Design an enzyme around this catalytic site. Sequence first.
Site, PDB file in Angstrom:
ATOM      1  N   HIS A 109       0.818  -1.235   0.000  1.00 52.01           N
ATOM      2  CA  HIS A 109       0.000   0.000   0.000  1.00 52.01           C
ATOM      3  C   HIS A 109       0.844   1.274   0.000  1.00 52.01           C
ATOM      4  O   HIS A 109       0.281   2.378  -0.054  1.00 52.01           O
ATOM      5  CB  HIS A 109      -0.954  -0.012   1.217  1.00 52.01           C
ATOM      6  CG  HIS A 109      -1.947  -1.132   1.170  1.00 52.01           C
ATOM      7  ND1 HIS A 109      -1.683  -2.376   1.701  1.00 52.01           N
ATOM      8  CD2 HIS A 109      -3.206  -1.197   0.663  1.00 52.01           C
ATOM      9  CE1 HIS A 109      -2.732  -3.166   1.520  1.00 52.01           C
ATOM     10  NE2 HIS A 109      -3.669  -2.473   0.892  1.00 52.01           N
ATOM     11  N   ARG A 145       0.664   9.806  16.317  1.00 51.75           N
ATOM     12  CA  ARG A 145      -0.593  10.141  15.670  1.00 51.75           C
ATOM     13  C   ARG A 145      -1.005  11.547  16.082  1.00 51.75           C
ATOM     14  O   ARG A 145      -0.881  11.907  17.255  1.00 51.75           O
ATOM     15  CB  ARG A 145      -1.656   9.126  16.057  1.00 51.75           C
ATOM     16  CG  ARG A 145      -3.014   9.573  15.590  1.00 51.75           C
ATOM     17  CD  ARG A 145      -3.897   8.472  15.162  1.00 51.75           C
ATOM     18  NE  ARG A 145      -5.108   9.031  14.561  1.00 51.75           N
ATOM     19  CZ  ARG A 145      -5.310   9.133  13.255  1.00 51.75           C
ATOM     20  NH1 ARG A 145      -4.372   8.768  12.375  1.00 51.75           N
ATOM     21  NH2 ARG A 145      -6.494   9.575  12.817  1.00 51.75           N
ATOM     22  N   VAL A 146      -1.425  12.353  15.111  1.00 51.82           N
ATOM     23  CA  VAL A 146      -1.947  13.700  15.344  1.00 51.82           C
ATOM     24  C   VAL A 146      -3.365  13.752  14.782  1.00 51.82           C
ATOM     25  O   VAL A 146      -3.610  13.367  13.634  1.00 51.82           O
ATOM     26  CB  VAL A 146      -1.047  14.787  14.734  1.00 51.82           C
ATOM     27  CG1 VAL A 146       0.286  14.759  15.436  1.00 51.82           C
ATOM     28  CG2 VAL A 146      -0.854  14.569  13.214  1.00 51.82           C
ATOM     29  N   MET A 173     -10.672   6.955  16.503  1.00 50.19           N
ATOM     30  CA  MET A 173     -10.926   5.680  15.827  1.00 50.19           C
ATOM     31  C   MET A 173      -9.665   4.885  15.478  1.00 50.19           C
ATOM     32  O   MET A 173      -9.763   3.892  14.727  1.00 50.19           O
ATOM     33  CB  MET A 173     -11.755   5.911  14.538  1.00 50.19           C
ATOM     34  CG  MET A 173     -13.247   6.384  14.870  1.00 50.19           C
ATOM     35  SD  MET A 173     -14.115   6.570  13.339  1.00 50.19           S
ATOM     36  CE  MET A 173     -14.310   4.838  12.745  1.00 50.19           C
ATOM     37  N   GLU A 174      -8.517   5.249  16.031  1.00 56.35           N
ATOM     38  CA  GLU A 174      -7.262   4.611  15.587  1.00 56.35           C
ATOM     39  C   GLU A 174      -6.297   4.213  16.681  1.00 56.35           C
ATOM     40  O   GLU A 174      -5.486   3.304  16.445  1.00 56.35           O
ATOM     41  CB  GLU A 174      -6.523   5.538  14.620  1.00 56.35           C
ATOM     42  CG  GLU A 174      -7.226   5.684  13.243  1.00 56.35           C
ATOM     43  CD  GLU A 174      -8.315   6.784  13.262  1.00 56.35           C
ATOM     44  OE1 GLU A 174      -8.352   7.577  14.245  1.00 56.35           O
ATOM     45  OE2 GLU A 174      -9.205   6.770  12.381  1.00 56.35           O
ATOM     46  N   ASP A 221     -14.959  18.325  19.124  1.00 57.32           N
ATOM     47  CA  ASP A 221     -16.408  18.254  19.350  1.00 57.32           C
ATOM     48  C   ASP A 221     -16.601  17.799  20.779  1.00 57.32           C
ATOM     49  O   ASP A 221     -15.685  17.262  21.413  1.00 57.32           O
ATOM     50  CB  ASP A 221     -17.077  17.298  18.345  1.00 57.32           C
ATOM     51  CG  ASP A 221     -18.579  17.591  18.135  1.00 57.32           C
ATOM     52  OD1 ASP A 221     -19.097  18.559  18.737  1.00 57.32           O
ATOM     53  OD2 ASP A 221     -19.222  16.867  17.327  1.00 57.32           O
TER      54      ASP A 221
END
Lengths: 240, 241, 239, 239, 241, 240
Positions: free
Chosen positions: F12, F95-96, F187-188, F211
């Site tokens: 990928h 992760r950001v 979600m990760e 949010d």
Amino acid sequence: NLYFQGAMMSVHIGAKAGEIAERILLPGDPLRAKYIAETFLEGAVCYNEVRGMLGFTGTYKGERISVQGTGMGVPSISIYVNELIQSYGVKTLIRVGTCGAIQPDVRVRDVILAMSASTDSNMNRLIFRGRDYAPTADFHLLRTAYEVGVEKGLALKVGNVFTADMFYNDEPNWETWARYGVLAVEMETAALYTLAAKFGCRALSVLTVSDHILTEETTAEERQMTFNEMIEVALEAAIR
Amino acid sequence: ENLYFQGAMMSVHIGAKAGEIAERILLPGDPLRAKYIAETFLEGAVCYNEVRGMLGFTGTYKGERISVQGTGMGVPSISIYVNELIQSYGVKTLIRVGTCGAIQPDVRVRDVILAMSASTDSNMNRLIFRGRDYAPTADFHLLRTAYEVGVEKGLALKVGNVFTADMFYNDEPNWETWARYGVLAVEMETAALYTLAAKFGCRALSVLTVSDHILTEETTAEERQMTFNEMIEVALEAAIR
Amino acid sequence: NLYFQGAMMSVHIGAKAGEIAERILLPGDPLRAKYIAETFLEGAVCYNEVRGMLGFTGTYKGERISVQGTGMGVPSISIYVNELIQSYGVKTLIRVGTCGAIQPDVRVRDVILAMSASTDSNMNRLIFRGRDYAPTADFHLLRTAYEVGVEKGLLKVGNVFTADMFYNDEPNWETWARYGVLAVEMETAALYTLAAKFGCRALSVLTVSDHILTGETTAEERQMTFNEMIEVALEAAIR
Amino acid sequence: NLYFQGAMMSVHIGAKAGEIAERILLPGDPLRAKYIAETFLEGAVCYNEVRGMLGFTGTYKGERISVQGTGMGVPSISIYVNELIQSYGVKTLIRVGTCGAIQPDVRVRDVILAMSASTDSNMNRLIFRGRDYAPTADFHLLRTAYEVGVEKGLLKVGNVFTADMFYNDEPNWETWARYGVLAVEMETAALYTLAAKFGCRALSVLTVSDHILTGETTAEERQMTFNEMIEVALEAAIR
Amino acid sequence: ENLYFQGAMMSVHIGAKAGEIAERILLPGDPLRAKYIAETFLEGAVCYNEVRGMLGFTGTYKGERISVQGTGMGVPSISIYVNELIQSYGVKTLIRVGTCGAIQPDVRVRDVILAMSASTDSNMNRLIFRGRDYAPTADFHLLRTAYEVGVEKGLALKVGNVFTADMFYNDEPNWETWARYGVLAVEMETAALYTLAAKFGCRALSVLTVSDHILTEETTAEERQMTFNEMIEVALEAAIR
Amino acid sequence: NLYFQGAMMSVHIGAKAGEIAERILLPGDPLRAKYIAETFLEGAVCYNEVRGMLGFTGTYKGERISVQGTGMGVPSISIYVNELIQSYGVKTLIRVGTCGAIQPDVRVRDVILAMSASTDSNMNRLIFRGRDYAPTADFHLLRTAYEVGVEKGLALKVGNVFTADMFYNDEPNWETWARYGVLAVEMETAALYTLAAKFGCRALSVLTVSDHILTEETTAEERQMTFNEMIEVALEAAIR
Ligand code: NA
Ligand code: NA
Ligand code: NA
Ligand code: NA
């Protein structure tokens, strides 16, 4: 011997209102609670003898500190932690204990700060409807303990521990847990971290490596010296 | 020394010399109740274990050697002691004595229950039997003896299923559902005792006094004392027959 | 062929009220229910032929007794047991059948009293939201049948395993045997659970008809042991 | 009454080799297998009476066809299907039976072709170690039966739910209906799984005999729809 | 704006105006394949979404309005797009087009598979159906149409079960067990597509080209191009009939 | 389109050997990867366009840094993280991203450092035979990010996040997760932390609250300003 009284009535702890400090150390062995209270605290008095699960209150650097035995395993510590929090208003809980290392770079007498705890207890699968809750230490306690360990020059690993229900397990699969970074086995931390989070309290486990699944012989003096260092880390973490 | 990776046969939680523990043993949860039982009912009782304060004693009852060992609370604690007793000291007959909380309208405080089996919310057996349902079950002949001894003393003795809880404080016990399917009472150890006893070919029974009721009677110290003494005598008789 | 009527309506049993005694024997084979009714009962009348699942009512030592076929497996016996208890007021239910032994010291033709039943059915995981329910026999029924077997000099008492899958690629029998399971059958867990649910007394009396190890008899041997099992069951029902 | 012999030994079916055709219809009622054999088959011979679970072999349009009763529920049909496939070489298996509808737009006497089967049985969780297997019909069988129903102007195609518990306190039917489940029965998931396992073609043809909402016919209505279902099944088997 | 708590009807991942998306939609995983499909097969195609680069297009095929929308990889990604397409834009017919990995000896590279249903190791349905087994299933009439279109073009078209994986890289797929029970091929989205389509009364199908085999044939760029074009035509025909 | 090639062949990601730095930032949106590379890195070049999932390499304070889009959800990020680690030798992964707050004392535009992640993904239940693994951040990355947040005076909460499979969930039970201390949904992170631990790599998620389940209106300038602060925290954490 009452079962349905509610945790705020704390039927396993015979302490009067106020006899337990807001900051508490939690060894598993009540005889270690007595050693800690006699060795490190000033003016220590015993507030509980129910089931022989001794607890004491005294002072450390002028701050009020309690030390309470917990028994072995998630169901035992969950009884005492529920009662301490809901009945006595305890807010800061440091477990001090041992663990069995499963990583090759962790040595006997290393001190581990448990950032989080994996488990094979069913307690959280039943609360969260089969989803995965990650029991996690209070960050500021953890960071404080880490800094104190630095001030003292200790060998201090920080990571995940595994809270076992079965000390004697025919199928622990330690190769799998180690592959995914688990440092060591013990039997209480997942319950401590989950219940502290539930009630908005601060929790940390400071653990001495007492055995290794691969390796190392030690002496009594060595063990007592490392125990003293772990207790001093916990006490400083509690009062800062 | 706090060793984790010795086998059960090394029994690191029990400080007894080889042979200091009898083949028949009573298992109260409370180490102070072990001491009371040993001093009150046994002749010549000697303490063989003080590790962690979890006292154990050996003495004689009606000329038979009998031990009595505190277990602590919950499946993980009792599973440590039972594994070590069986695998290190050759214990063969194990009678739990203790309390339980009734969840049935027709079970009354001070009733004595013989657990024929134990339901549980422990994960211990789901992990052994890859998610299938194992039924932890008492030894039939111990159960039958205890019942008959209870008849001899004109006692009640209800016989049925108990629920072994991990969470003394549980926000969602669903006691109505368990009571609907006949669970008599809650306690915290029997499922592990019965499973490990079966595993090693040993005989186990739990004899329990109802000490609380989800829907209720108050009692006196003397009343609790005489029911306690009656529970111990049933268990001691069951052990030596 | 209704689906959404209650058990009080007796969808699968074509008897009317009063035709079924409060004590019932539950073989799995309806042809074996017929055998029991003629051979051991006085005055046997057939109250049901729906689906061929024969049921009979008769007398034994002056007590009314029924004998009703269940099918094979937890879903089948659950249908019949729900309707028997909730429609016809059955109070005492004794299963009689065979089992496959998985213990070295249990032999073919031995008679097992199932104290409790392990299972791989999903029925109880779905009731108790994933927790472990132990389906257990009525103790007084169990004790009675044990004394009868002794009076008649026969009897192992323990846990059996109720299987969903007669043909199972992964039964893991060595694990169940390690933990004391005596033998495999396919109904007892559902009977013990439903009996407890509705406050009824249940018991399984089982004859070992096969062994995992010996892989195992004459026709005369099977039927003589069978009659002994029935005699225990009938006795336990009426005492 | 053996337990530990393989399915190639046909423990529960008392036929000998060659007596069972490669195409078989599987009603759940053995009395209904007898009806099908006499009414629709030419030359019907009974090859099995073990446990009353009648099975018959006959001819339809010059093709050999068998009809075999299964009991009720996944464990029962699993016994018969394993032995039919592994002992007698059955290759094409069409269940015919009833179901209870849970959709507003599905009516009593409608005929359902089960494309797939949801279930609350534990059978597949235990095979696929907790993962989700989708038991699915043979497509060519499904398509054939659909065209036959059209040729004859009848037919809903979708998912059914295979229940273990005919009497279930917590079926959560509104949830299954929300996700498209058409109706409840008690066997199809086991048939589709075992058929796929052994490379056989399977299909369930079902008649709605009850409805959760209408709670529902005359005898003449039930039997006329029934015969139409059989006609679809017989046709799908031979094409 | 990265809002988490708006409902699906607000479709925060899709930047289209109301009505810019057709009631019939093709769902490749790769946004660059969406663009290729739109430019190659559709007349007058316009891009309606560039949020996150997950391109979507609307155009016409044989006088019918058709959209084509990239989904990303995996059950969580496609479930976001499918929820928003259905609940915000009124999409009713959803055809996934993509690749899959065969696990059956008799399925060959370049075979086109119509997924009649999808197995999975996602937790999504275990959590909806409280641990019971839901079978995600294609719409029968779309499946039948696609098959017939495939016959018209003299194509193979295998029809059966596919496995929707969460873990492209899985140490324990147990492919032998899945293949034994007839699973044809692995992909990563169909179980969610079929479940959500059923939930909202929509029609869904996955048409998949075998691009790899667990036990093996190499292919040319042109061969892959013509099989791709054939898969798209089957899906487009299935959508407009 | 190969399925059975093995993660070390990274089908990928179209990057040549060496084009990806040992330290990488992981936004979910490839367009944010391009913004980060153009705004914060020197000399940035694009090394991947497969599936439009852009990745870039450049320099920050003279250290080589990569930025790679991940897609949404555990299965998407697990593909990219497996390939980055096993094929390209990536060792530090930050992760950001964004998250949706569920706690009343957490506000929109607060920055969260995820100490650990809860989840309803099945991925770890299938690895650990139904037991509970706690996906946990690398402590030294976490502590470093915390210290940098202090140097910058940011509103920085540290705790557990919940990694959802279902952005649209009819039964999230957020009241239960919040009771037990979960700060926010994304979600990760559970997959990132589990796979980094598996291969001995260091991982952290730095997340902006975008949010709230209870509450708050913001502007574009406000959002871009907070985004810039989160990126600067991540970059410093990566290179220290
Ligand atoms: Na108290
Ligand atoms: Na010892
Ligand atoms: Na939108
Ligand atoms: Na690559």
